[PDB]
Short mmCIF file of C-alpha atoms and ligand atoms in Angstrom, two decimals:
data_model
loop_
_atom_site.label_atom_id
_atom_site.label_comp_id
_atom_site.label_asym_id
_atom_site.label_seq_id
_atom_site.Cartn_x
_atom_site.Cartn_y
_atom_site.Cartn_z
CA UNK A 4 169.20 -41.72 -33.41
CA UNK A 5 167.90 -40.23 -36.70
CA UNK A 6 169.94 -43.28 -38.17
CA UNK A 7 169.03 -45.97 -35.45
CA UNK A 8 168.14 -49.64 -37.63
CA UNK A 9 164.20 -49.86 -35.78
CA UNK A 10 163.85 -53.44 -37.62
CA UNK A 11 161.18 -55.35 -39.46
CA UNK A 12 157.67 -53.10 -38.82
CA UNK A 13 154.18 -53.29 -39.82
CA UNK A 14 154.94 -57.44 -40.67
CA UNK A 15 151.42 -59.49 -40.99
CA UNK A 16 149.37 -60.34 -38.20
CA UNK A 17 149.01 -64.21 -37.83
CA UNK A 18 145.30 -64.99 -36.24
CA UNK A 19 145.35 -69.06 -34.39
CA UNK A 20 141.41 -69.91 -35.36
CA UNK A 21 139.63 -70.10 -31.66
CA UNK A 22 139.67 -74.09 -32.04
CA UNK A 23 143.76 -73.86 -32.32
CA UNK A 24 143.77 -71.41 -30.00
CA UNK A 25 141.86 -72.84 -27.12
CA UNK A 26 144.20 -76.15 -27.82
CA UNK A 27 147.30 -73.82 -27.38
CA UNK A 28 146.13 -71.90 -24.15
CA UNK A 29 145.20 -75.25 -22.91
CA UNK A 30 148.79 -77.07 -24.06
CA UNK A 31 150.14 -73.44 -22.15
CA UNK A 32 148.14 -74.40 -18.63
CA UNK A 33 149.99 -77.92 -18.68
CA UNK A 34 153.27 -76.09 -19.44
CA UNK A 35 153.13 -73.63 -16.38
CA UNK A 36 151.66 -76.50 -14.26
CA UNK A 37 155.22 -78.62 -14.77
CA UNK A 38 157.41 -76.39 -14.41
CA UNK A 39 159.73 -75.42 -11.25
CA UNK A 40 160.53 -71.82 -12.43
CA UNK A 41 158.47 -69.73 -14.80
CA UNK A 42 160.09 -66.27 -16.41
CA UNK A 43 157.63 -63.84 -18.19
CA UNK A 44 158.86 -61.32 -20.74
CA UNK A 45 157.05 -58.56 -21.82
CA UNK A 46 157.05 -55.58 -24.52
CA UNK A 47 154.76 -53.33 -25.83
CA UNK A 48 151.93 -55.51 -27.38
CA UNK A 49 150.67 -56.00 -23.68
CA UNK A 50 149.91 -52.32 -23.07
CA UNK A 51 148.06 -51.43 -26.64
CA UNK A 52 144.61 -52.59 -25.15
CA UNK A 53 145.48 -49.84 -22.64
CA UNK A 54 145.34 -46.70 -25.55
CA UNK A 55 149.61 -46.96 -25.60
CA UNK A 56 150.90 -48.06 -29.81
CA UNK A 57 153.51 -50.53 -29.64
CA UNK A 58 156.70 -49.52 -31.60
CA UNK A 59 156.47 -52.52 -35.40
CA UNK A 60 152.63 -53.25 -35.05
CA UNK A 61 150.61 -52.12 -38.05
CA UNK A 62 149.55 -48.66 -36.19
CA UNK A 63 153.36 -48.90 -34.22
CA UNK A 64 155.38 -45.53 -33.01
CA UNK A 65 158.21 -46.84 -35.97
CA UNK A 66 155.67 -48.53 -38.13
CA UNK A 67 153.47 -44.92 -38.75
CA UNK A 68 156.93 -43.48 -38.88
CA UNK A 69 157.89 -45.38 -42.05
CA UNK A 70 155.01 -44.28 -43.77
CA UNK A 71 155.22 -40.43 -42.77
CA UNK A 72 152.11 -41.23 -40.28
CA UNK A 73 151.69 -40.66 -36.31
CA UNK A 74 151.20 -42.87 -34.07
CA UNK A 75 147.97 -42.93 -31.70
CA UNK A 76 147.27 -42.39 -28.16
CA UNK A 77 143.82 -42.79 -26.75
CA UNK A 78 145.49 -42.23 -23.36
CA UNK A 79 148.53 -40.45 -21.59
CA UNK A 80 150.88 -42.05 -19.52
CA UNK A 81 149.99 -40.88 -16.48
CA UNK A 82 145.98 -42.39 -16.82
CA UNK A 83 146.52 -45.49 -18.59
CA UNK A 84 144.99 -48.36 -16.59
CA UNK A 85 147.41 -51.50 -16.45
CA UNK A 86 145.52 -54.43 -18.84
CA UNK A 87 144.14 -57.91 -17.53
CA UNK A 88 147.39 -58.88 -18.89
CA UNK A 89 149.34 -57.12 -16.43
CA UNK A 90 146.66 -57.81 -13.61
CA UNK A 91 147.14 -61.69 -14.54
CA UNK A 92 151.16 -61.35 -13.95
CA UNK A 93 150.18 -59.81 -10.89
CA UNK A 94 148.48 -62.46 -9.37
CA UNK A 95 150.65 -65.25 -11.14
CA UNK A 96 153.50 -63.54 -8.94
CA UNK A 97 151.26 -63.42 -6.01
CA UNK A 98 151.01 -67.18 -5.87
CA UNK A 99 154.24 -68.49 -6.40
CA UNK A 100 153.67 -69.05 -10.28
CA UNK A 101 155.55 -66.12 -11.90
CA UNK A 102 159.50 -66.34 -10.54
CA UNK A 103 160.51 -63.33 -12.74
CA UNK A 104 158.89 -60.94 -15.05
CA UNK A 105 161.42 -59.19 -17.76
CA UNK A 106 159.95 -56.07 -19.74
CA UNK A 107 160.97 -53.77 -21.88
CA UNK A 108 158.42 -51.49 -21.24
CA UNK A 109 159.46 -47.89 -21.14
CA UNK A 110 155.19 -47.14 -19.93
CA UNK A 111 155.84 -47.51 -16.09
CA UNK A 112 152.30 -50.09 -15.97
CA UNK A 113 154.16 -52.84 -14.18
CA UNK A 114 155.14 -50.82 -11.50
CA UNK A 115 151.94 -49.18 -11.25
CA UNK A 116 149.80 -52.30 -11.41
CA UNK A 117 151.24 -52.87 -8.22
CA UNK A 118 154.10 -55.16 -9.05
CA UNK A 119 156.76 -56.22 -6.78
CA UNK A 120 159.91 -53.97 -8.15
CA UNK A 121 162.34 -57.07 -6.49
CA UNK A 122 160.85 -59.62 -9.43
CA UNK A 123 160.74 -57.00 -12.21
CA UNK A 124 163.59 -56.34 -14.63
CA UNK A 125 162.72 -52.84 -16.88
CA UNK A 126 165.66 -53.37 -19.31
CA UNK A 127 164.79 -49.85 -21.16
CA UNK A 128 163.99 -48.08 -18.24
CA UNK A 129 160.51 -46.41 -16.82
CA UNK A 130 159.18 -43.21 -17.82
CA UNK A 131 157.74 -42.48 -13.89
CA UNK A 132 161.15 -43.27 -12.24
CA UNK A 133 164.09 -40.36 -11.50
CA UNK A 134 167.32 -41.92 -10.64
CA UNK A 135 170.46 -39.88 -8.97
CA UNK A 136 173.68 -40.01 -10.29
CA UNK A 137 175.78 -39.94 -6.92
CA UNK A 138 173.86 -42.33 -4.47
CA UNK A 139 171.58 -44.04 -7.35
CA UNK A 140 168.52 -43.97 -5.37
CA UNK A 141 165.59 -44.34 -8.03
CA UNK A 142 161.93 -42.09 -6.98
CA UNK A 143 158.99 -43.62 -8.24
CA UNK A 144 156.81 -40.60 -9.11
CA UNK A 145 153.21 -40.28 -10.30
CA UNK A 146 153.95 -38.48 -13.40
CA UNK A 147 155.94 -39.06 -16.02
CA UNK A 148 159.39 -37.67 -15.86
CA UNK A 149 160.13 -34.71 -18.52
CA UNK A 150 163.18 -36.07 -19.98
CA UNK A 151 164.64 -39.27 -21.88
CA UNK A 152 168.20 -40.39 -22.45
CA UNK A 153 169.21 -40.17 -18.92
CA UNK A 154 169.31 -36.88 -19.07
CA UNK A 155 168.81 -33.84 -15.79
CA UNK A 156 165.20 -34.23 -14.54
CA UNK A 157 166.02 -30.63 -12.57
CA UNK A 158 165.24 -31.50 -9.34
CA UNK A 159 168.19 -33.04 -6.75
CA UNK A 160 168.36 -36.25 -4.38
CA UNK A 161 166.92 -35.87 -0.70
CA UNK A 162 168.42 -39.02 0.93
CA UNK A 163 168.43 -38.47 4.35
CA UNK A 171 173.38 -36.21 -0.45
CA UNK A 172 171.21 -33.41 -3.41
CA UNK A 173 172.20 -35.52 -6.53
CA UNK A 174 171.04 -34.39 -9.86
CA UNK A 175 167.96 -36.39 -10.78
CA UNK A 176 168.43 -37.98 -13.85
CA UNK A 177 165.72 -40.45 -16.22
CA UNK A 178 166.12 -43.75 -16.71
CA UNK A 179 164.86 -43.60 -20.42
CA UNK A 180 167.88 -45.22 -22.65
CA UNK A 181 169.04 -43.99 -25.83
CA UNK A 182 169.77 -45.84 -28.94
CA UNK A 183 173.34 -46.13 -28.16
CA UNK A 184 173.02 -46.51 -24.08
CA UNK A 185 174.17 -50.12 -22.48
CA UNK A 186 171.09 -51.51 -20.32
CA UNK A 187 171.24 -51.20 -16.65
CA UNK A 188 174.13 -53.85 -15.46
CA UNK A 189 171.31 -54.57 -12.53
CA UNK A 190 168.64 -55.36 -14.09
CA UNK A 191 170.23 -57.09 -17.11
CA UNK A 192 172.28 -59.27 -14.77
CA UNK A 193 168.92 -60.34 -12.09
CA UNK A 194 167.09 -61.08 -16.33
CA UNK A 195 169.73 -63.24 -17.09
CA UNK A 196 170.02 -65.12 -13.89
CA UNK A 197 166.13 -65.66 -14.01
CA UNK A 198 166.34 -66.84 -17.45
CA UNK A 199 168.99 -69.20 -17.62
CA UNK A 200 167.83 -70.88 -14.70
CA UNK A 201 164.05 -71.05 -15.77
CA UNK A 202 162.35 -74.09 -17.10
CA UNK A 203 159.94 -71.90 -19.08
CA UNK A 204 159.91 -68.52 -20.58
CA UNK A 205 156.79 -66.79 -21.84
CA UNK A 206 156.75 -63.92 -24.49
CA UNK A 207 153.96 -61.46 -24.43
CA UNK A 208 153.79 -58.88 -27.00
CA UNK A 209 157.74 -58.28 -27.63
CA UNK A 210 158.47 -59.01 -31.64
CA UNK A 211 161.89 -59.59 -29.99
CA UNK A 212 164.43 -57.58 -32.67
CA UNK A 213 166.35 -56.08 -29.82
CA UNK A 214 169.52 -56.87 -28.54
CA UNK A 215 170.17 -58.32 -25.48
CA UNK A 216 166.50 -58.03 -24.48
CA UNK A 217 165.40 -59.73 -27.16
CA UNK A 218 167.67 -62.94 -26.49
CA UNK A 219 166.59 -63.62 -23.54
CA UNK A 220 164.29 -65.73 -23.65
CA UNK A 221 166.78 -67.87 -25.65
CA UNK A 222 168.60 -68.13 -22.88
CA UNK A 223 165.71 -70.56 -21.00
CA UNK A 224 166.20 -72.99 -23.77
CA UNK A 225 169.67 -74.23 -23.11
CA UNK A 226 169.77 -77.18 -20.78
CA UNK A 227 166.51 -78.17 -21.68
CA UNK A 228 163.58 -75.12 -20.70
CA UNK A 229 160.85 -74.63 -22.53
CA UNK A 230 159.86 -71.57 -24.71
CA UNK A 231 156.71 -70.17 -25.35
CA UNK A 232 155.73 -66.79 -27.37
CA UNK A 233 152.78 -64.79 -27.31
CA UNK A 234 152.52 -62.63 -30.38
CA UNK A 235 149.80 -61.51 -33.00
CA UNK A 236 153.09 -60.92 -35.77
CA UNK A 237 156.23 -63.28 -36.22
CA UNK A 238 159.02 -62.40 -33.69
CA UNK A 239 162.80 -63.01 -34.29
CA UNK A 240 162.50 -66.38 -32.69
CA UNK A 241 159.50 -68.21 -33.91
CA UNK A 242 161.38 -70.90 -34.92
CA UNK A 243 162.76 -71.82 -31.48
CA UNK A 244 159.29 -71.57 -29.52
CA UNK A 245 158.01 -74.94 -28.25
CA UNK A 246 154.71 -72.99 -28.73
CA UNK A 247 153.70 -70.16 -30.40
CA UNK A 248 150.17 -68.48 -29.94
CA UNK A 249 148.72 -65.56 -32.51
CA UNK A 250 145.92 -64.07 -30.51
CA UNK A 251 145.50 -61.20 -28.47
CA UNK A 252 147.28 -61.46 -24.96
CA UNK A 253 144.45 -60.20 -22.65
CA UNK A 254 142.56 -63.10 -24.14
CA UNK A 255 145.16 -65.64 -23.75
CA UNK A 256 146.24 -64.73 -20.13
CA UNK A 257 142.47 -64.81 -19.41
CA UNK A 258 141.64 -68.34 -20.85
CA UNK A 259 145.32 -69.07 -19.39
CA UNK A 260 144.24 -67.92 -15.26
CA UNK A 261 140.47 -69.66 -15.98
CA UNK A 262 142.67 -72.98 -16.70
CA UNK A 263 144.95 -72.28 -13.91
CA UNK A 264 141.73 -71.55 -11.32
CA UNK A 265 142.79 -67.98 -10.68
CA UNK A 266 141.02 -64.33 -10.28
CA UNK A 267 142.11 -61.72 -12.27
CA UNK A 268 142.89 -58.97 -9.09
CA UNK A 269 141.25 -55.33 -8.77
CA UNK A 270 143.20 -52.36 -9.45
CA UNK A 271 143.15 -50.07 -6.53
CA UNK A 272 145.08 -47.26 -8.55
CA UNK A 273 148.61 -46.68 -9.19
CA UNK A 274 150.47 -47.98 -6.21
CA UNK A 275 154.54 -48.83 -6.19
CA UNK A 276 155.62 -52.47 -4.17
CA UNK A 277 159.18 -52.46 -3.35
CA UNK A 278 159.54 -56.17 -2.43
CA UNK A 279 157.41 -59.12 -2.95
CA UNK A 280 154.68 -60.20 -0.20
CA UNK A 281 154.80 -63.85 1.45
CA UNK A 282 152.76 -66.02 -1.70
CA UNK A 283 149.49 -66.86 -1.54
CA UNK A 284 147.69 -70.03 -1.80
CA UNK A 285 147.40 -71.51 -5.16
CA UNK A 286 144.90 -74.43 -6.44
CA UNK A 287 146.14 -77.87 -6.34
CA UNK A 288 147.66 -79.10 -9.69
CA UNK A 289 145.86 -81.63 -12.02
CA UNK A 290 146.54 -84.96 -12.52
CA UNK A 291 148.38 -84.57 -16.27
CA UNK A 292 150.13 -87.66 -17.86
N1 AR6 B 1 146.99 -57.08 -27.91
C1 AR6 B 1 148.06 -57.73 -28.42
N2 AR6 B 1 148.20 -59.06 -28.22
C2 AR6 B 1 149.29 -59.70 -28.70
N3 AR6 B 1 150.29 -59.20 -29.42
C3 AR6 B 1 150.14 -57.89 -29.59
C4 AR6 B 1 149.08 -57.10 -29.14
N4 AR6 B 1 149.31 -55.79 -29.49
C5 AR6 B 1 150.48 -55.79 -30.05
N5 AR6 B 1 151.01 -57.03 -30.19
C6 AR6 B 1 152.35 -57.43 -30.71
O1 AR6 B 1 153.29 -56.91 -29.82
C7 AR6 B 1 154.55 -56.80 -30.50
C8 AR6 B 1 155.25 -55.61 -29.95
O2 AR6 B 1 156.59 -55.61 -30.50
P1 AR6 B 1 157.34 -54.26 -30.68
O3 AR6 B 1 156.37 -53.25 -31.16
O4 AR6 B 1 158.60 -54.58 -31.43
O5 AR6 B 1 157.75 -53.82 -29.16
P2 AR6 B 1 158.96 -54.50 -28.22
O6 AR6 B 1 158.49 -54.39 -26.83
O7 AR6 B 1 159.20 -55.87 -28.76
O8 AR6 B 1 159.99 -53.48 -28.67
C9 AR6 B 1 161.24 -53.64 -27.94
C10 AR6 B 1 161.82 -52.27 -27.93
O9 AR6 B 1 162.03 -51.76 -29.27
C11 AR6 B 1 161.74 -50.37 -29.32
O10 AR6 B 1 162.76 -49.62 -29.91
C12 AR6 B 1 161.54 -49.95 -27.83
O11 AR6 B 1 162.75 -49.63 -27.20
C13 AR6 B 1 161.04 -51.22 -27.14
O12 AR6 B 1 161.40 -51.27 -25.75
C14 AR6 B 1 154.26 -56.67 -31.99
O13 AR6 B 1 154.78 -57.77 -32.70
C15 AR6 B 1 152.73 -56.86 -32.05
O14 AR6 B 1 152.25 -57.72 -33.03
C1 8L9 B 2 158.76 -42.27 -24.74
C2 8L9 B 2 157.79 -43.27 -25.35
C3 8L9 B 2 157.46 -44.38 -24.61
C4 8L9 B 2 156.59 -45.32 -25.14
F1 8L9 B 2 156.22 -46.42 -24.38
C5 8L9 B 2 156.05 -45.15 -26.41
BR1 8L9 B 2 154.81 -46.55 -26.99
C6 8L9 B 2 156.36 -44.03 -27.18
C7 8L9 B 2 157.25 -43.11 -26.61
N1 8L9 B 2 157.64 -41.92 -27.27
S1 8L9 B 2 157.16 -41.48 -28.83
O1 8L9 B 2 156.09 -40.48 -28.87
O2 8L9 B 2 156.50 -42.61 -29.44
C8 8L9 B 2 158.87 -40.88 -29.28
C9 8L9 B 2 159.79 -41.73 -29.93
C10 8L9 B 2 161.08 -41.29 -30.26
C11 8L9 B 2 161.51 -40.02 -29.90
N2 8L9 B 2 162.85 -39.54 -30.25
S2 8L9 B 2 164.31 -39.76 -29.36
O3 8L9 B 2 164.92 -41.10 -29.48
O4 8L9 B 2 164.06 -39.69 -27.92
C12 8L9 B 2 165.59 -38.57 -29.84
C13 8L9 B 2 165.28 -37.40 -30.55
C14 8L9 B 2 166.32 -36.51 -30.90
CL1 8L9 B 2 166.05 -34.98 -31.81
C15 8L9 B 2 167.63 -36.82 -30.53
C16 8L9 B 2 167.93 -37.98 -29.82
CL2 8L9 B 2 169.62 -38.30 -29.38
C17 8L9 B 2 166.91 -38.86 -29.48
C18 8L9 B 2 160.64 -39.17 -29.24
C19 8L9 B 2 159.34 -39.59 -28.90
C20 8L9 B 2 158.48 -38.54 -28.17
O5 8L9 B 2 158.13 -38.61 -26.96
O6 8L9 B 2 158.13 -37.54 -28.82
ZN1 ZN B 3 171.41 -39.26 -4.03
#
């Protein structure tokens, strides 16, 4: 806890000049457009254009730490708005591009932006969500919930059973939910491409993932303004600032970026939209 190894922070940002970086976005539209099943995975990096630090960015939670500094909130939790990122992944899912979307977001913006909680993995748990220890039913609530490390919430189950509430915030030394880890790893070994947004990728199993997509043949592709543990195995790798990628990325791909009507909770994916016809790309 006090001795818990937080990895490589505060490493260089890497900026793709807007020439490279309009190639790569573009190279990016062609791989979503082939392939049969695309996973996303997301960290931290998406939700700092939101007022929420990431953990080993230059102005990171760890990164500040290491220096004696604090990190910075220009929000709370509870009024953060989900990014055009998370909009985009929204929509992606909506028509039938995103299959899965793995995060290791703690900041509950998925949920919120109105993602369907059937295609979503959060592999470190959600800082709105209550879970009771005898029947397991998991409360979606509109504020945060006081505690981390799975600990008593103080307030008890009311399936139609009084279980102590308990977070779903791991500790250091917790093992990831056996749920959501196993639907992540299913969705990633059987994708054909796997898209990092924002994760530097130092954690265990999380982390690996992605990885997992490349054996028998999937692509890899990492979003990311610093290196990440697995540069070198990316069949792409983009430096630039997500919300701008993702919004080159759904002009390419002939899609609206969808309102936000507020913080709403989706328990299972809707019948998917239509989606523009491909283009012609060989
Ligand atoms: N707007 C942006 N666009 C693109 N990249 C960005 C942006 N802002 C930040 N980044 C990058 O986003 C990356 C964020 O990486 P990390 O900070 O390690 O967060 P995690 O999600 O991988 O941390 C995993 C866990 O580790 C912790 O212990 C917690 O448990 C987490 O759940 C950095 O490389 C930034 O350069
Ligand atoms: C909870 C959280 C979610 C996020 F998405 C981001 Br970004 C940041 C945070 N929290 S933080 O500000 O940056 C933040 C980070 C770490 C901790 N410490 S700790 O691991 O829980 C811990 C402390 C002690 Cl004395 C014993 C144990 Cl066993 C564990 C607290 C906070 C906080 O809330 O004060
Ligand atoms: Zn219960």
């Amino acid at each position: 806890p006090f001795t818990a190894d937080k990895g490589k922070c505060g490493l260089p940002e890497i900026f793709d000049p807007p020439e490279e970086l309009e190639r790569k976005v573009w190279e990016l539209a062609r791989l979503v457009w082939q392939s049969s099943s695309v996973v996303f995975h997301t960290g931290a990096g998406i939700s700092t254009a939101s007022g929420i630090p990431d953990f080993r960015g230059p102005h990171g939670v760890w990164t500040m730490e290491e220096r004696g500094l604090a990190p910075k909130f220009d929000t709370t939790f509870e009024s953060a708005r989900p990014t055009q990122t998370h909009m985009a992944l929204v929509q992606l899912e909506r028509v039938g591009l995103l299959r899965f979307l793995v995060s290791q977001n703690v900041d509950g913006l998925h949920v919120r932006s109105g993602f369907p909680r059937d295609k979503l993995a959060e592999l470190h748990g959600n800082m709105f969500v209550e879970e009771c220890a005898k029947c397991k039913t998991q409360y979606v609530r509109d504020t945060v919930v006081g505690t981390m490390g799975l600990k008593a919430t103080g307030r008890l189950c009311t399936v139609a059973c009084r279980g102590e509430l308990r977070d779903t915030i791991l500790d250091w030394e917790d093992s990831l939910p056996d749920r959501d880890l196993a639907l992540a790893d299913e969705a990633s070994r059987n994708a054909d491409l796997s898209i990092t947004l924002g994760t530097s990728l130092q954690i265990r199993p999380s982390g690996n993932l992605p990885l997992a997509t490349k054996r028998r043949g999937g692509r890899l592709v990492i979003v990311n303004l610093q290196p990440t543990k697995h540069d070198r195995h990316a069949d792409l790798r983009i430096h630039g600032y997500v919300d701008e990628v993702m919004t080159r990325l759904m002009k390419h791909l002939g899609l609206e970026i969808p309102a936000w009507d507020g913080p709403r909770v989706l328990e299972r994916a809707l019948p998917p939209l239509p989606r523009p016809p491909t283009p012609k790309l060989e």
